[PDB]
């Protein structure tokens, strides 16, 4: 009832949107793995009278149930999607997508990890975005490659309308304690692809991570913080 969806919140199955600001939403879903359940976010950004989806809802079914929540909420086409790295909260739905008229999108290099790992492959290449610093537009958002960090292809997502960063894994919220999951890290690269998003961000106003609750800058120098203290 207007608070950020959580795990207990969002029925077996199902996806929840939440308004981060006009013409901006997150989606949140859950999945199980490796015998837990954890929950995961995404983005929508309206493009006109079209939407772009950043991010999957992790998996097949969630991911046809998140098509189903926005055109029950938002009543408007998803026409493109891009992901921001290869793990399947990321990719997993990708089939769904192209085979419901989505064009979907990811860097060269997180379609190479997805191949090589097995998990859904975008069908579209986006170029420039392969030295960290770079920076891209794409419809309603810019597109930006802070270096390796929750994984070696992550990429960032601002929404210039509204000031909103989408960190997408490379950020962490405000209560975790942990650096999540860390398989495919770079711990000692990650503080300073953090300090480039801050460096190019100074204005964001709402930064959302890849699993749990939005909020401010903060969340940059919280996820620098719990990275460093990991690896250490
Ligand atoms: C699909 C994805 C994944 C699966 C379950 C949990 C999380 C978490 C996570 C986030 N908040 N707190 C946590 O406790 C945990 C994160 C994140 O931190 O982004 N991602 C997760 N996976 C799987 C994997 C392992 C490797 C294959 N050997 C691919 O790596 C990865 O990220
Ligand atoms: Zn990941
Ligand atoms: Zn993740």
Same mark, same amino acid.
């Given at each position: 009832?207007?608070?950020?969806?959580?795990?207990?919140?969002?029925? $077996?199955?199902? =996806?929840?949107?939440?308004?981060?600001?006009?013409?901006? +939403?997150?989606?949140?879903?859950?999945?199980?793995?490796?015998?837990?359940?954890?929950?995961?976010?995404?983005?929508?950004?309206?493009?006109?009278? #079209?939407?772009?989806?950043?991010?999957?809802? +992790?998996? &097949?079914?969630?991911?046809?149930?998140?098509?189903?929540?926005?055109?029950?909420? !938002?009543?408007?086409?998803?026409?493109?999607?891009? *992901?921001?790295?290869?793990?399947?909260?990321?990719?997993?739905? $990708?089939?769904?997508?192209? &085979?419901?008229?989505?064009?979907?999108?990811?860097?060269?290099?997180?379609?190479?990890?997805? #191949?090589?790992?097995?998990?859904?492959?975008?069908?579209?290449?986006? #170029?420039?975005?392969?030295? *960290?610093?770079? &920076?891209?537009?794409?419809?309603?958002?810019?597109?930006?490659?802070?270096?390796?960090?929750?994984?070696?292809?992550?990429?960032? =997502?601002? $929404?210039?309308?509204?000031? =909103?960063?989408?960190?997408?894994? &490379? =950020?962490?919220?405000?209560?975790?304690?942990?650096?999540?999951?860390?398989?495919?890290?770079?711990?000692?690269? +990650?503080?300073? *692809?953090?300090?480039?998003?801050?460096?190019?961000?100074?204005?964001?106003?709402?930064? !959302?991570?890849?699993?749990?609750?939005?909020?401010?800058?903060?969340?940059?120098?919280?996820?620098?913080? $719990?990275?460093?203290?990991?690896?250490?």
């Amino acid at each position: 009832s207007g608070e950020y969806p959580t795990v207990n919140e969002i029925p $077996v199955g199902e =996806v929840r949107l939440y308004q981060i600001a006009d013409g901006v +939403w997150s989606h949140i879903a859950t999945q199980s793995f490796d015998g837990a359940v954890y929950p995961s976010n995404g983005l929508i950004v309206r493009d006109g009278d #079209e939407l772009l989806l950043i991010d999957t809802a +992790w998996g &097949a079914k969630n991911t046809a149930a998140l098509l189903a929540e926005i055109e029950k909420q !938002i009543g408007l086409p998803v026409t493109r999607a891009v *992901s921001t790295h290869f793990h399947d909260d990321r990719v997993g739905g $990708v089939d769904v997508l192209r &085979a419901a008229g989505v064009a979907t999108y990811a860097s060269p290099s997180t379609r190479r990890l997805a #191949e090589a790992e097995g998990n859904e492959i975008p069908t579209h290449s986006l #170029e420039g975005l392969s030295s *960290s610093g770079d &920076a891209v537009r794409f419809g309603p958002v810019e597109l930006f490659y802070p270096g390796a960090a929750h994984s070696t292809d992550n990429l960032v =997502v601002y $929404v210039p309308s509204a000031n =909103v960063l989408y960190g997408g894994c &490379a =950020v962490h919220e405000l209560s975790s304690t942990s650096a999540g999951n860390v398989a495919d890290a770079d711990l000692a690269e +990650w503080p300073t *692809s953090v300090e480039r998003i801050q460096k190019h961000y100074p204005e964001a106003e709402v930064v !959302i991570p890849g699993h749990g609750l939005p909020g401010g800058l903060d969340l940059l120098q919280h996820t620098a913080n $719990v990275v460093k203290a990991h690896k250490n």
